[PDB]
Amino acid sequence: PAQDNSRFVIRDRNWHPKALTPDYKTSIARSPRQALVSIPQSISETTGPNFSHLGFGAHDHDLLLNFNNGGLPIGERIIVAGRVVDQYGKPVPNTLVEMWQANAGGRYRHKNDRYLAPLDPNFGGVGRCLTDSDGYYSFRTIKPGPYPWRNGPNDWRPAHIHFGISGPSIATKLITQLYFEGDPLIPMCPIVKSIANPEAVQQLIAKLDMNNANPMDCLAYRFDIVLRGQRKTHFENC
Amino acid sequence: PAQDNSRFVIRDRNWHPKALTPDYKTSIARSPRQALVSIPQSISETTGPNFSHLGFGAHDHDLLLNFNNGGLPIGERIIVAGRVVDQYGKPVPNTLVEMWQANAGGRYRHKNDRYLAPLDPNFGGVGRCLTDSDGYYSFRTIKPGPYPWRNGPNDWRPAHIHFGISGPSIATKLITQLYFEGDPLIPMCPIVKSIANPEAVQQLIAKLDMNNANPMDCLAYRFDIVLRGQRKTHFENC
Amino acid sequence: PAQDNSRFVIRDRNWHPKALTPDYKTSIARSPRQALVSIPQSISETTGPNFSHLGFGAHDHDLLLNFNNGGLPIGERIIVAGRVVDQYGKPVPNTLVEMWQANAGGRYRHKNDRYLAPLDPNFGGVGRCLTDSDGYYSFRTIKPGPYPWRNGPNDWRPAHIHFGISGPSIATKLITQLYFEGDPLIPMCPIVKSIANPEAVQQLIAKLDMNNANPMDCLAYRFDIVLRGQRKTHFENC
Amino acid sequence: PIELLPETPSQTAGPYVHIGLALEAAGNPTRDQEIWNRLAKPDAPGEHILLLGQVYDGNGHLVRDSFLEVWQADANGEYQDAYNLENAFNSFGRTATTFDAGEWTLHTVKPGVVNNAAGVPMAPHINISLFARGINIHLHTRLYFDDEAQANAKCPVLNLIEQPQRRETLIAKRCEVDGKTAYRFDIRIQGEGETVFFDF
Amino acid sequence: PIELLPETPSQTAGPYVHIGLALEAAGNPTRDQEIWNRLAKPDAPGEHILLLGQVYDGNGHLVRDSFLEVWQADANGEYQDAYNLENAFNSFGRTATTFDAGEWTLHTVKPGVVNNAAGVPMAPHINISLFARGINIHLHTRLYFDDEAQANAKCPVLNLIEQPQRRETLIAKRCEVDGKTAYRFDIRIQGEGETVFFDF
Amino acid sequence: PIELLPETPSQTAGPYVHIGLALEAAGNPTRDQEIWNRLAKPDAPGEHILLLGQVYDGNGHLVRDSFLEVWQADANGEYQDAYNLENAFNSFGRTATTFDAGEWTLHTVKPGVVNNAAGVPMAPHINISLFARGINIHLHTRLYFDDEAQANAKCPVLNLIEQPQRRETLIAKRCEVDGKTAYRFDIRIQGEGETVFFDF
Amino acid sequence: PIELLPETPSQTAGPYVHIGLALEAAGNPTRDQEIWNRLAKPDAPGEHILLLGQVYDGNGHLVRDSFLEVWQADANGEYQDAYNLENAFNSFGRTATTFDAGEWTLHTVKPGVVNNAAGVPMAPHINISLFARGINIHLHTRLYFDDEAQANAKCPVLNLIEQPQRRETLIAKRCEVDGKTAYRFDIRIQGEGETVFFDF
Ligand SMILES: O=C(O)C[C@H]1C=CC(=O)O1
Ligand SMILES: O=C(O)C[C@H]1C=CC(=O)O1
Ligand SMILES: O=C(O)C[C@H]1C=CC(=O)O1
Ligand SMILES: O=C(O)C[C@H]1C=CC(=O)O1
Ligand SMILES: Oc1ccc(F)cc1O
Ligand SMILES: Oc1ccc(F)cc1O
Ligand SMILES: Oc1ccc(F)cc1O
Ligand SMILES: Oc1ccc(F)cc1O
Ligand SMILES: Oc1ccc(F)cc1O
Ligand SMILES: Oc1ccc(F)cc1O
Ligand SMILES: Oc1ccc(F)cc1O
Ligand SMILES: Oc1ccc(F)cc1O
Ligand SMILES: Oc1ccc(F)cc1O
Ligand SMILES: Oc1ccc(F)cc1O
Ligand SMILES: Oc1ccc(F)cc1O
Ligand SMILES: Oc1ccc(F)cc1O
Ligand SMILES: Oc1ccc(F)cc1O
Ligand SMILES: [Cl-]
Ligand SMILES: [Fe+3]
Ligand SMILES: [Fe+3]
Ligand SMILES: [Fe+3]
Ligand SMILES: [Fe+3]
Prior knowledge:
part of a larger assembly; 7 chains; A: mainly beta; two-stranded antiparallel sheet; 4% helix; C: nine-stranded mixed beta sheet; globular; binds [(2S)-5-oxo-2,5-dihydrofuran-2-yl]acetic acid
């Protein structure tokens, strides 16, 4: 079983978005009004699931093939790849990376999406993989389209892919969103702008990666992820 | 019939791309090696077709509806609109604007396109319209995807829409390409870079136009076009 | 017989003052805590009253004559004039412009004003007019004095004139305040500073306009007003 | 992106708004023609109704200096934009809360049904814009009628309010005031029972 | 000071989180192996229990699109981190609220006691992380059990909550669902009865 | 100096120009009205002629994807600018090379003489603009007729070409196609026999 | 975008390249082991062939200081990267043009067929890289065989050359040199008959 053998650097909750960001309207009633209670790290917080023994299907990381209903999806073929490291720069191997997204026209395959843009019969919008022994992950997909939504009267999400990353403990687990280099919707989005620091926003922008492209086939984007730094315990209980 | 009643400002052929731009490989053997011969404007050059009496179908400007085979195209729904003016800032009304493009995944509906990305059964890729009495045009379409092509070993066109504009004479007729604000492929493209002056490249970049968007429906881009300045003849033959 | 033929550019509610601006103390209990609910424009929102046939008295725009009780008001004689346009730069003709203000000493002719500065027996402080066919309005008045008020313990409104503008629809209707070029109270006022963006504050500062002055008679200030941009509907219900 | 000229920013109307927009309430004389709270003359077609209400702040206290503008269809569901005091009906009017009691009144007819931009019928409603001291930009709301339950349930605007409980804040209560049909519509700017306010 | 690489910033999971993390709930087909809400095979050691709950916003309305991750010791006080659908017990699981009733469920065993880093026993608890539309960074809490009052009163984590009234928000209520032992743990994100949320 | 707004810069039409401007050639359905290569109805005034040609690159290879626009006077020396598929004659048309043989065709009448701006007669000519993949800005030329030698020798435009040998590149060769009067006008973009291209 | 470390830029080998890479040709002594122009010892399996050729500049003049590197499969279509002078066959070698006559020679076996990355057979070929004074970055080409016409016609690399006439520049001509099977492969760097050069 798991052991308490490390500590994780405390989060900067001014680098992360705060809970109450009223321009993102749904945050108003879904943000605590009392302060978070700080607690010291114990085995409950410094351990978490490892997914090395989860059974992955052959196409779980390949959204061009994992919802195959007679053909290929319509849209901009792209590889999305990167490295997961911690704040000390150490790779995070064998960690679970999950992603979900709309199709090329901004339509989600979800029962609650009422946007008029059509579903793509060959696109589902879900991927997962494990980082390799050096911390690298890779997905193949189509670039999602921007998504209008009922926030302000003319609000549109930039093109984006939702990400979840487990990391070594429940203290490191993170959900975030990837945006695409140059997208003019990024500075206008109230969800992006839930992050107060512009340098933090830049950390969510994936860069065009021509080096990783397959000529005559697909482009590529690179999105590196940084989880909380992990260190050994020291000088405790004395 | 047409009359010779105006002169058109001489083109700046260092603002336009030159003929020989070898990084665009097909230009090498398809560029003249002799100088162009300058000739004065006559009625042959200062007149041209007007298309006010061309019969347009109801959906000729609407690429979401003009190739209807049972549904809507997949892709980022957008209006592409702008104004055609001349170099003196005068609107160019009742002028023919034509456009053509690939689908959301960068596939063209043309017998010679061998790219593996699929056709969209509800998308053709052709539009036309006439500017209104104030010089404005409008199309509705989906945003095209980047297009790999056999130039260098890993070359990709930025997302683009081809445009043709007639204007008042054969001296004003122009074919060009529209690119999209922020696209990181633009600085890398040898066709874009056939234009030597970076300020001229910027003139081909359409801007996101939230004011013209239809909420919960489609985004919009604005692309203004400038044709050669037209002036009355003066002090000729004396 | 009003018709739904236009759309109005969505408001930037970070350019406008937000509801909750606590240094303006009365805003604390008079600001909603729930998000506004965005709704699409319908004929209910895109129409509004036209006041072309409201009956104006001869001096309704002339505060030097419209409360005449034996003489002229005491104070700095000024013309206040400007143009009402929309965000596309189009004039807004035949629109209702209403204004109200304190007298030269900062005293309002209102039963609830208990400031010790005296009323002026020849001054009422109310004007109205219609913009002309080119969007221009004009008032004649005296420059109002600053007004102390029970906000903080030593708060003073800058000299100001309250404005209401109808525009083409209930969606364009606006109430605002005009301030005067150079007034050192402007940066200190918590009502001015309900506007977060300093560039937006500048849009409320009327400029001295010597070109519009009557020598040996009255000075003049220019205050232009911009209402929401109006455009034709396009590509709706298809 | 394309950036247009910015709109002139809003400011509060302040507590002396009635100097400019409700002259009598300020304690001052009126002009020959004023825009006020009687939208319908007696001969106007439709069901003649009195509307009345009070406005509350976040502490549950009356907002005694409120100024309201209203915009509604006639009984046949048509908006009448040609404002004229000679008209039997005008679609536009103004009212204000009394300083002692905090109550506003409007004399009108019940509006007919008007379709939204997609052709879907909206339930009968009056569009309201609320201004006052402390309100930096006016608040938009709608007054619907409690005797139009079937129409209200199907209204495409009411249905954009996610929680049914909040929809209830927009429904005026039918009653009788000195022998005349009336509807009471209270507005709560903040807190418990907060009235839905719109952006458009 | 020493500044490390900044952590990637959080963003909301959004209302379509189910596409990625709760496939059946999205209305979509599932993959051969999914991480879900049954932590214990029938023969896992310990007391088999159902956990269930609803999630409320600041207006008292159900948060019907919430997604929860849980982490708990097994009945013997051991964290089983080698996730495997063939395990008798997994310490990790996922659940989500139903869209109709807003209720999530978890099938598990009652966790055994584990010590904190100073060697002091913590009362039996489930670690919970809550994600949803409107939640920009997930909320951490703990579910404790109302039939462990003696242990709860001595828990060095519960004792870091300054007010006893707030400690009560973390205590799940024993009940029975279909005649089987259950504990209900409702979460109130905001306002009256607001659930304690942790930073660590 | 006075600097006007710059002209929008040209770009290549690319090899899929047919999608937009020659729909049938792309392999695609046509619209009810298309601008194409039959300038004259059978009963149009003048001498009915076929024009045809091939386009060569600097290596002597066919440019199989070229697109041409033409502008010419009618038989009476008048430019008919009011484009209409019902016109007896249109001064404007479009054509494109076939992909197999690289040959374009035009059906028209021989143009009448028009004067230049100084009142000097120009020899009968077709104005041509050539577009293709690899051509960054279109190439302007003129097609003159080999059976108008006297007029050609006096043309004030041909006389602006300094070398007589280069003037020969603009002279189409009379021939017969299917027994009907035709003129062949091959264009050599580059190298030996390079066609004169104009700026104006 | 993502920018990697830039590659070290190329420079010409210059006219004294043989000091470093062809020691004998410089007029200097050799080391015990040199990389040179005999890829096959007599006992190597396959058809033993002599290759020879001359290199021409844009004026049709011999390039007498050319240096060539070659890379080819063995007779069974396998690339042998373990370079060793003890081997019966090496896939790699070097040659240079003689200063008097301008001719290079290679002694090898005809390569077997190797598949491209999509599994499509390529026609038998030798990969060549050409270096010299005046050549700033080396030129890549391929030598194919005129007695493999059927395979050459179907080669997916040859088919990427748009013009059939240019494909002909890559086909070596079978002949006999003092009683041995040989193929002549001349390279024309520039102008008439210019050899196809590749980027990859
Ligand atoms: O109180 C309510 O529930 C509804 C609100 C709408 C009219 C009114 O008088 O109050
Ligand atoms: O009942 C309470 O108020 C306590 C809170 C903890 C568990 C639960 O169901 O609600
Ligand atoms: O025959 C030539 O060389 C002249 C050139 C002009 C017409 C044509 O067919 O080619
Ligand atoms: O000359 C040619 O046509 C082909 C070229 C390839 C081998 C050779 O000797 O010359
Ligand atoms: O806890 C809070 C309470 C009120 C507020 F405005 C912000 C907070 O973060
Ligand atoms: O803000 C909105 C805009 C368009 C729409 F259809 C619904 C909305 O709530
Ligand atoms: O006409 C030309 C000739 C040779 C060259 F390199 C460039 C040219 O523009
Ligand atoms: O440069 C290329 C790259 C990939 C391919 F399939 C063909 C090419 O000519
Ligand atoms: O007289 C006063 C002076 C300052 C203030 F804030 C309130 C008052 O009543
Ligand atoms: O601008 C004002 C400030 C305070 C007040 F009471 C009334 C005003 O008109
Ligand atoms: O749909 C509704 C409309 C009005 C109301 F009061 C309650 C509702 O649930
Ligand atoms: O990014 C999103 C925005 C709005 C929404 F309803 C779902 C999303 O996934
Ligand atoms: O110490 C406590 C622990 C749990 C609780 F519900 C109340 C307490 O006072
Ligand atoms: O833009 C393009 C690029 C290459 C091609 F083959 C066709 C195009 O339309
Ligand atoms: O003047 C000329 C005109 C046409 C031509 F072919 C040759 C000439 O010398
Ligand atoms: O660098 C050099 C320059 C000229 C030359 F002849 C030989 C070289 O090696
Ligand atoms: O396809 C070909 C291959 C080699 C050659 F010499 C000519 C061809 O047409
Ligand atoms: Cl007084
Ligand atoms: Fe005031
Ligand atoms: Fe999303
Ligand atoms: Fe293209
Ligand atoms: Fe050297």
